[PDB]
Amino acid sequence: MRLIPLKAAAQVGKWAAAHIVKRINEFQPTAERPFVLGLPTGGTPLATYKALIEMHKAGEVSFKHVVTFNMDEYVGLAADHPESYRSFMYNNFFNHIDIQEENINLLNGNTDDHEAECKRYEDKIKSYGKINLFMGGVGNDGHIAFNEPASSLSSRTRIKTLTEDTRIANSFFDGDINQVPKYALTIGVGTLLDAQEIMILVTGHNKALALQAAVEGSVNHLWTVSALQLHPKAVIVCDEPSTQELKVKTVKYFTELEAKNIVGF
Amino acid sequence: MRLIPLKAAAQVGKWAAAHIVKRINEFQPTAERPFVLGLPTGGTPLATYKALIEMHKAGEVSFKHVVTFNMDEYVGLAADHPESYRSFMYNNFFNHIDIQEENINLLNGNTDDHEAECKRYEDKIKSYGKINLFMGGVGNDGHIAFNEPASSLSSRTRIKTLTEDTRIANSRFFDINQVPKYALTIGVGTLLDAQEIMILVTGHNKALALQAAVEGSVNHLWTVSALQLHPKAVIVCDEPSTQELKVKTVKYFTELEAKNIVGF
Amino acid sequence: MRLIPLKAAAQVGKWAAAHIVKRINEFQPTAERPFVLGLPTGGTPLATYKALIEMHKAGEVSFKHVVTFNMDEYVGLAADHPESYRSFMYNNFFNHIDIQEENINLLNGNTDDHEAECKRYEDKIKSYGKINLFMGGVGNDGHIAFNEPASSLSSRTRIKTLTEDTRIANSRFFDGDINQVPKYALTIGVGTLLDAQEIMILVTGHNKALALQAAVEGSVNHLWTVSALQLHPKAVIVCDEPSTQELKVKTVKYFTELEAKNIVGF
Ligand SMILES: [Cl-]
Ligand SMILES: [Mg+2]
Ligand SMILES: [Mg+2]
Ligand SMILES: [Mg+2]
């Protein structure tokens, strides 16, 4: 597994954005052969989204034939509610680019059969063959999306009960827990692993235990992210604060192995 | 991988038995499409067998279209002998339920070609497609069936030489010299090929195995840890087996699986 | 995974040779159906090559229908240069046996398309189906061939930049002149290695003690590539006593007893 050690989150976002553009332009997407991109939400990928937008503004990439899949959506919340995952993506990304409505895919949190909605999504992915690049972040406990630790590595898109901790964390909702959704639809670990490439963004001191588990730890189902060690092409892009629990030699190792790719970041 | 932390072995057996009944009833087996169930022997699964027999007597499940496969059998011991694995399965389980002779499968320890016998067993499993649910226990050193620690994850059904410790253990039931030297056993790959694996684990002497299984990483010295790579594996355990786990670990799964725990 | 604990490298070599002989003669190779053998270079496999030669001279095995692939080759260096992997293989093994020229496969380090040459090499391997037995060594840090630690387990045959440590090491064979030492090598990938039907890794010396520990007692871990062999269907490590220094007493005791029958006479 690749590690990209950078100093600040801003550089992480730039490197991640540069990496996404590199892959799009090498792929040469067309209407028949779209580039298929998996996408996350939250504070971490936000620097990436703004780097991408400016790169697009500068004429360095088009999303006209890029198809996207997001990892998550709240169950029960209006799609156009400002706190929906859909809203996060449109207001922080899609609205700023030349992406096409038909090429955007998000889980529908408000159908009358969650199982069927989750299956529809998996089928849609499979209809393109394979996700070309999947971006994500990682929980403090190494989890991915709303998949619990000890999630099966072959787990698929399904409904998840939000943890008590997550719910009180997300109390955007007028400081009210009763308004926070109890369930989310989320992609599975197997759904993730099926991507041709996985790129995980890791920033902040709070993720230091998770990075250690992912980089120096061994394959362990309690730290879901460590499973990427078995994936054919996986990248982690990280900042200096997230490296605190690593050995000095570990950082030295990857900083030098990736030296050529770190230049200009 | 799932962990079901329960108080005592009695509840483990009942939980496992309920889960087997759920799967059978969800599957709706028929003559054409039987339910295929992998089975272990020994003290631990005994509770499960007895609860199953009760549920069946209560009208809660039928084994008429259930096909079974066992993990092991001794080499050289008469099938009808009281200490055979065949005898264990009939005297403690099969004789009590509506299962059909033609759907019971066990290894034959007394052919003139063990390699072919083992091959025959694998072939028959594959004539049903897959094993739908495989129940097992686990060694103190995390091994499965008669597979050695450090067994290949792709190991198949084969003859195995019994360790002198296992043979010493069984001396009560025979004098060391009349205790069998070899067993036929399914491989780790045989096991992993199942749709679902349920491993029952009870007692203070399995705490290191459980630790390795749940908190440890994937390691060929603890065969059971490979379950972490299985699509659907679940471990059902008792309090004495959790002594080497962290408090937070037990707490995690106890609360995660709470809705599946109630009643047990 | 199998661990064969032996006293000294001499016996490790004789064991590995006899295992290679055992697999060839059970396979019974012909023109139509050759035995495909993957091979390493260096001081450690040397003892195996010597014992293989003595076994062949006494009439115990024939390489007439044995097909070979090697792990590595320097980029930019004449293939007949004494320090090429080709030269190692020929001078220490191939010149001494009844192997056929057309059945020998090595990477060409001197084409104008390294990617195309690595692709050609993978294609040739697949044209035989599988490598029946792949013999290798391990780095002090657990790496395989010229694959970096943290190499994808799916990595394929490709060009690799030598670390300065390795280039410092090989400067002796280029007469103390690092500026003579090759900058690149072509190497089979970890996915390439793992595709073999069987993998046998030789581990000798006190300096491989940590790699062997990571490999045998450690868990599956991309920083120690050799630990992925825990996931391979049929892997064996043959090792000497110096290499076991970081293992537990009981770990050596277990495999020594487990493999006692296959150890006798070694
Ligand atoms: Cl080395
Ligand atoms: Mg637009
Ligand atoms: Mg009956
Ligand atoms: Mg010759």
Q: From CA A134, how far away is CA A152, in angstroms rounded? A: 19
Cβ of residue B1 closer than 8 Å to a chain A Cβ: yes
A127: closest CA among A171, A85, A69?
Answer: A69
Contact across the interface for A150 and B3, Cβ inside 8 Å = yes
Q: How far apart are CA A227 and CA B109, in angstroms?
A: 40
CA-to-CA distance for A250 and A248, rounded, in angstroms? 5
State the residue for tokens 């749709």. Answer: B195
| Nearest by CB: C233 against B149, B154, B219 | B154
The type of residue at C59 is G
Neighbours of chain B (3+ CB pairs under 8 A): A, C
Q: Which of A148, A221, A240, A245 is catalytic?
A: A148
Query: Cα separation of C57 and C62, whole Å?
Result: 9
Identity of the residue in B1, B219, B256 whose CB atom sits nearest the CB atom of A221: B1
Q: Which amino acid, one-letter code, is at C7?
A: K
Is any Cβ of chain C less than 8 angstroms from the Cβ of A253?
yes
- Edge-to-edge strands, sheet with B66-70: B2-5, B233-237, B197-201, B133-136, B35-39, B66-70, B104-105
Question: Is any Cβ of chain A less than 8 angstroms from the Cβ of C42?
Answer: no
Into which CATH architecture does domain B1-264 fall?
A: 3-Layer(aba) Sandwich (3.40)
- C150/A1 CB distance under 8 A: yes
Q: How far is the CA of B97 from the centre of ligand 3 (A)?
A: 4
CATH number of C1-266: 3.40.50.1360
Which residues 6+ apart lie within 8 Å of B156 measured at CB? B118, B122, B186, B187, B189, B190
Ligand approaching nearest to the C-alpha of B53: 3
Provide the token pair at C97. 């046996």
| Neighbouring C-beta atoms of residue B238, cutoff 10 Å | 24
Q: Are B42 and B169 in contact (CB under 8 A)?
A: no
Q: Are C97 and C56 within 8 A, CB to CB?
A: yes
Which pair of structure tokens corresponds to residue A231? 């994936």
Name the active-site residue from B60, B122, B141, B257.
B141
Contact C3/B150, CB-based, under 8 Å? Answer: yes
Chain A residues whose CB is inside 8 A of the C230 CB are none
Residue type, B231: P
Collect all residues of chain B within an 8 Å Cβ-Cβ radius of residue A182: none
- Answer whether A216 sits within 8 Å of C222, measured CB to CB: no
Our measurement of the distance from residue A265's CA atom to the centroid of its chain's CA atoms, rounded to an integer in Å, reads: 21
Q: Is the dihedral of CA C80, C84, C86, C91 positive or negative?
A: positive
SS3 readout for chain C: CEEEECCCHHHHHHHHHHHHHHHHHHHCCCCCCCEEEEECCCHHHHHHHHHHHHHHHCCCCCCCCEEEEECEEECCCCCCCCCCHHHHHHHHCHHHCCCCHHHEECCCCCCCCHHHHHHHHHHHHHHCCCCCEEEECCCCCCCCCCCCCCCCCCCCCEEEECCHHHHHHHHHCCCCCCCCCCCEEEECCHHHHHCCCCEEEEECCHHHHHHHHHHHCCCCCCCCHHHHHHHCCCEEEEECHHHHCCCCHHHHHHHHHHCHHHHCCC
Containing A160, the helix (H) or strand (E) segment is strand A158-161
Q: Are strands B182-185 and B158-161 parallel, antiparallel or unpaired?
A: antiparallel
Kindly determine whether residue B218 and residue A220, on different chains, have CB atoms separated by under 8 Å: yes
Reported in sequence order, the residue ranges of chain B that DSSP labels E, i.e. its strands, are 2-5, 35-39, 66-70, 72-74, 104-105, 133-136, 158-161, 182-185, 197-201, 233-237
* C-alpha distance from A230 to closest chain C C-alpha (Å): 6
With beta carbons less than 8 A apart as the criterion, state whether C53 and C17 touch: no
Q: How many helices (H) and strands (E) does chain B have?
A: 9, 10
First-last CA distance in chain A: 20
The helix (run of H) or strand (run of E) holding residue A68 is strand A66-70
Say if CB A254 and CB A3 are below 8 A apart. Answer: yes
A171's CB contacts (< 8 A; 6+ apart) are A177, A180
Q: CA of C148, closest CA in chain A: separation in Å? A: 9
Contact B148/C at CB under 8 A: yes
Ligand with minimal distance to C141 CA: 1
Which chains pack against A, by 3+ Cβ pairs within 8 A?
A: B, C
Residue to substitute from B2, B192, B198, B218, interface A, most A β-carbons within 10 A: B218
Catalytic-residue membership of B98:
no
A234 vs C contacts (CB less than 8 Å): 152
Among 3.90.850.10, 3.40.50.1360, 3.50.50.60, 3.30.70.270, name the CATH number for the domain at A1-265: 3.40.50.1360
Neighboring chain A residues of C215 at a CB cutoff of 8 Å: none
3-state secondary structure at position A74: strand
Question: Does the annotation count A239 as an active-site position?
Answer: no
Size (chain B), residues:
264
Catalytic residue among C60, C141, C246, C259: C141
| C-beta separation of A35 from A27 below 8 A | yes
Residue in B229, B232, B234, B255 to test binding to A, most A beta-carbons within 10 Å: B229
Whether A183 contacts A75, CB under 8 Å: yes
- Rounded to whole angstroms, how far apart are CA atoms B195 and B120? 21
Task: For tokens 């599988």, name the residue.
Answer: C130
Beta bridge partners of B62: none
C212, C247 contact by CB (below 8 A): yes
All residues of chain B having their beta carbon less than 8 Å from the beta carbon of residue A217 are 217
The answer to whether the CB atoms of A232 and C150 lie below 8 A apart is no
Assess A256–C contact: CB distance below 8 Å, yes or no: no
- The single residue of A60, A83, A122, A141 carrying the catalytic annotation is A141
A183-186: strand order across its sheet: A72-74, A183-186, A158-161
Cβ-in-10-Å burial (0-12, 13-18, 19+) of B40 comes to buried
C115 at the B interface (CB within 8 A)?
no
C72: Cβ–Cβ under 8 A, 6 or more apart, which residues? C41, C85, C107, C145, C146, C185, C186, C187, C188
Chains within contact range of chain C (3+ C-beta pairs < 8 Å): A, B
Whether B141 is a known active-site residue: answer: yes
From the CA of A56, which ligand is nearest? 2
| CB within 8 Å: B230 and A152 | yes
Q: Does C150 touch chain A (CB under 8 A)?
A: yes
Interface residue C232 vs chain A (CB under 8 A)? no
Nearest ligand, CA B63: 3
- To which residue do tokens 């996207």 refer? A68
The residues, any chain, with a CB within 8 Å of residue B26's CB and separated by 6 or more, are none
Chain A residue numbers touching B230 (CB-CB < 8 A)? 152
Q: Which amino acid is at B52?
A: L
The encoded tokens of residue B233 equal: 């594996």
Domain boundaries, chain A: 1-265
Helices (H), B109-229: 114-127, 164-170, 188-192, 207-214
Give SS3 for B3. strand
Q: What is the distance between the alpha carbons of residues A244 and A204, in angstroms, rounded to a whole number?
A: 10
Q: List, as one string, the DSSP characters of A28-45.
A: ---SSS-EEEEE--SSTT
Residue A141, CA atoms < 13 Å, CB-side half-sphere: 16
Strand partners, A164: none
* φ and ψ at residue B78, rounded to 5 degrees: -45, 135
Contact partners, residue C121, CB within 8 Å, separation at least 6: C69, C105, C107, C157, C186, C188
Nearest alpha carbon to residue C147 among C169, C48, C137: C137
Provide DSSP, A89-144. HHHHTGGGS---GGGEE---TT-S-HHHHHHHHHHHHHHTS--SEEEE---TTS--
State the distance from the centre of ligand 2 to the C-alpha of A9, rounded, in angstroms. 26
Q: How far is residue A216 from each of residues A138, A209, C63, C151, C152, measured CA to CA in Å?
A: 16, 10, 43, 13, 15
d(CA B146, CA B169): 14
Q: What is the distance between the alpha carbons of residues C92 and C204, in angstroms, rounded to a whole number?
A: 19
Name, in order, each residue with C-beta under 8 angstroms of C152's C-beta and a sequence gap of 6 or more. Answer: A1, A231, A232, A233, A234, C190, C191, C222
One-letter amino acid for residue A13 of the chain: G
Q: What phi and psi values does residue C152 have, to the nearest 5 degrees?
A: -55, 135
Residue C163, token pair as written in the block = 């670390």
List the resolution, Å: 2.1
Closest CA in chain B for residue C261: B161
Residue B149 with chain C: CB contacts under 8 Å: 254
Compute the distance between CA of residue A255 and CA of residue A259 in angstroms, rounded to an integer. 6
Which of A219, A231, A233 faces C220 most closely, judged by CB atoms?
A219
- CA distances A34 to A24, A103, B30, C253, Å, are 9, 9, 46, 58
Query: Measured between alpha carbons, how far is C128 from C34 in angstroms, rounded to an integer?
Result: 8
- Please report the number of interchain residue pairs, chain A to chain B, with beta-carbon separation below 8 angstroms: 36
Distance of alpha carbon B209 from the chain centroid? 15
Residue to test with chain A: of C143, C146, C148, C152, most A Cβ within 10 A: C152
Interchain pair B228, A219: CB under 8 A? yes
Method of determination used here: X-ray
Q: Is B82 helix (H, G, I), strand (E, B) or coil?
A: coil
- Name the strand (E) or helix (H) holding A198: strand A198-202
| B148 assigned to active site | yes
Residues contacting C194, CB < 8 A, separation 6+:
C153, C228, C231, C232
Give the sign of the dihedral formed by CA C42, CA C47, CA C52, CA C54: positive
